[PDB]
Amino acid sequence: RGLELLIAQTILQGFDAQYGRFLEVTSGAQQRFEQADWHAVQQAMKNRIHLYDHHVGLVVEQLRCITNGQSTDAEFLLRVKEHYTRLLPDYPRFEIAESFFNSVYCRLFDHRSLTPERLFIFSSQPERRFRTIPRPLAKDFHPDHGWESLLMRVISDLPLRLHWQNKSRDIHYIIRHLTETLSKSHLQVANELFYRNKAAWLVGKLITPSGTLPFLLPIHQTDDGELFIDTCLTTTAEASIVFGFARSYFMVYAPLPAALVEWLREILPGKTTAELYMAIGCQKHAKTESYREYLVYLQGCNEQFIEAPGIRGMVMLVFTLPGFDRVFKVIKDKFAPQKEMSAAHVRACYQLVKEHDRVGRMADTQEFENFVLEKRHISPALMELLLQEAAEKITDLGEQIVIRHLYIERRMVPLNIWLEQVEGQQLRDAIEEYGNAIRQLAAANIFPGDMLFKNFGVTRHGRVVFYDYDEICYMTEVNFRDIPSPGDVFPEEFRHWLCADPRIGPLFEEMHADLFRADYWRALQNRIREGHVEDVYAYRRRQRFSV
């Protein structure tokens, strides 16, 4: 009885589908760049985020249409795992074929049925070598006439059909970066072209005799006509930023990413197997993966989960492990009578950033409906607030305690902690990146709401990234004047909380003489509604060719 193969054939055409439109979507971004539609560029991720669930939220449904006889026991919930697996030996996109299965089970079963043979949480039996690259995935450009002519190839064999602005002036520029340290090093520009936002990214590795290093060649336009490749990145420091966790991922038309995640593995050395599925847009395998990498850490170190650094939230419950890169954000119950019927506003702000353009000042997350936590890895201190600030939200499960719809984002260093830790030349850029963080947030349609110091984070290189997502609304959702009543915003009212430190508030003037002032916030909301939103540069406004 093909009862549990009709299924496995069904949940695996869900994927084959989910990925079906994935790459048509991804493959509209070349034209949509010639074409002038950036309403379209900002709304396409928003279609990419949806397909995966758009395709499980049918196989999930059409499953139940005949899932009545022996509908469930794990007896046969397992022949689905076998039947499904046995069907993926030259399935090169198998890692994500498996990954589609997971979120389904977990949807039919409250993200909650048993582990490890009750799901694909690890890759099965390929597994390890990703040399799943039948085609080259990039071409090998070697210097014969070198660096005035060969790099002419790149710009000429681009499928991009538009009068360039000065290729020949770009050629003179590019060598200026190259001479920092040539021609005994080949070139390997990649295919296809990496797209995000108002930009196009020419990706490549400049292999040099000393060593091999990244080589990024981003393409731009004079909005809305004439285009100029701009700025020449080749640095590990730069590769990591562009590809950062505070900026939205990529439109790379990749029907094999597990291999592509292998090519860039040497463009972005520090990056994780799950940071590399994020970028290409396969964020739903980052999640199986992050967790895959996560559950290695604590199942291999010392000691337990603690409460995160900084200030305790009015809403969220935040924990982490002192060695680990990531934070877990659990929501409180408020009290016993208060009933979690849902919409949630909070889950809406966390989602309504799941699709938004973050631009470097906002960081992404993961969602699990029921996460099983080690009762033995739990401090007894973390537990006490955890137990009774989220009681309705969890359940003791014998040796384990179960928690529902938890959020995970890159651990950071709370700003207000660090603001204290620094002063001097350092203290300069901790305010600048702050206001800049609040200038760019605004332009993205993001007005921070509670804009206090500790709701943002920082990086090793030193940068601010917001992470407080209830007091968030669209810029067209607030009205701006404090002259002398719900939701309205008073821009100078902000002069109280933020200039409070008489070491840092003075220095606010030095860089942000107008964020205090109301006029300037109609400016940004108002210029968002003319159809215009300035997109982001993946570098310092100081590197640009323009200055």
Added chain:
Amino acid sequence: PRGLELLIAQTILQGFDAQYGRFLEVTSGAQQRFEQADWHAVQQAMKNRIHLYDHHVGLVVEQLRCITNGQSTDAEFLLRVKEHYTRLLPDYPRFEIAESFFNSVYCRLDHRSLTPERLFIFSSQPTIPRPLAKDFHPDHGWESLLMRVISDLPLRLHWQNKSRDIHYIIRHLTETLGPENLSKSHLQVANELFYRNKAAWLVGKLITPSGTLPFLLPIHQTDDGELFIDTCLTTTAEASIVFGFARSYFMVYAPLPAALVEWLREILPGKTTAELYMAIGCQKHAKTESYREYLVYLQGCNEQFIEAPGIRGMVMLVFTLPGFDRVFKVIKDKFAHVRACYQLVKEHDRVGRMADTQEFENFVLEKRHISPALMELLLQEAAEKITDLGEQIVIRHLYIERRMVPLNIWLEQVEGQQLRDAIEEYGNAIRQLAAANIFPGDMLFKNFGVTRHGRVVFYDYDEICYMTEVNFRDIGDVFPEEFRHWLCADPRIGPLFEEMHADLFRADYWRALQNRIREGHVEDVYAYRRRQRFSVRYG
């Protein structure tokens, strides 16, 4: 509205891209298996890929009928369900084949009450987004611009003396175009390559403002991994035969057939859309538009349906028209092994020596275009399941093929080189099949026909078998000497046959050419007049 209206219409459009996307998973897996030279698989990837559609329609059908519990498929729900189907097709690039895949499902659920209200079986019921091709300009020589185009090709095997080719491609162009006229004549080349059999073609268009003309450069290697181009192909008439109908399916990776079909158009302005779709394997948007071409054609024509000329088949009852270029092949009943035999060629690498077919179980004709000369021949000899309905009939399990002219007949409207020309090909029609693991059980002039550009093909798989179920014993069981009785029967035609195709008669080509299959070999079919290869007669 908590029903199947939405559940259902998107339950279909899912099997659809669940289907096509894996179509390209293999369609692009071909370079790596040609590259590897794993050509056995090249023949199973032309089985696999042929399978995909059929499985996804079969799957939804299981899903489809299951979702709406119990028996009934309703008609005004079949409209309800359709109205939804289009409103999701608008941002669809491959929406052309989304309407097709709709149809195969209605037919799966015995095609009763077949259309126009209830499905969209035509060209389209009602700006290129990306890279399609690329340009190359004779600015710095053509000797330099035949190494350029090439260093943007996928292949990872190392070309051995690519030096000759660049200089060897010039001439086909030079003696035909004129060294003055190839100063400013440039190239348009498709970003991906057409992979068939042992081949990895390069399909581009040559641009000479002395017209707009095709350009075709097959990539061949043998044994260890040598690479070179097996002739150059430029004039219009070559292209038919490389994209031709006796052929096996083509293997080019495009996620957007409409551009790819449409791009290739001007190369040979040769006929239609169903031919130019199927040349990629998208035969199931061919099995549709060939219903359009079926419908349009007879709209302003005063013809009728008649039997196709030739010597009435033992094999199979056939009808057709005066100016129609395709033949209808209702299988005789009470002479199924044809169901299965007729698609062992479909399944097979057709060699150009075999015709494509398309199968309709329940198929409709206006009996007015039917003349009762042919009525009772259909009404009686194909009557097992005849359904007559006042002014219309529906035929069951009927195949089709382009209607070439029959050979026996071709031979009298022939003499001169014409006979030396036409006979040569026939024996080479029998030779190809063996090498292709194919045996003609009745291999008579009766059952072979002639192509536009004078080729003979084998459209009688009715007594077919792989040559690996047969013995050709010297003196199932076959007597290659006695074929001359029926073969060498005319004192105008035969003798020409002892001149060239004398081996066909001796069991030693027969037997000893089999040992060459069940040893592993794959036969070098070619898609050119052989004389055309660069080494032969050129160098």
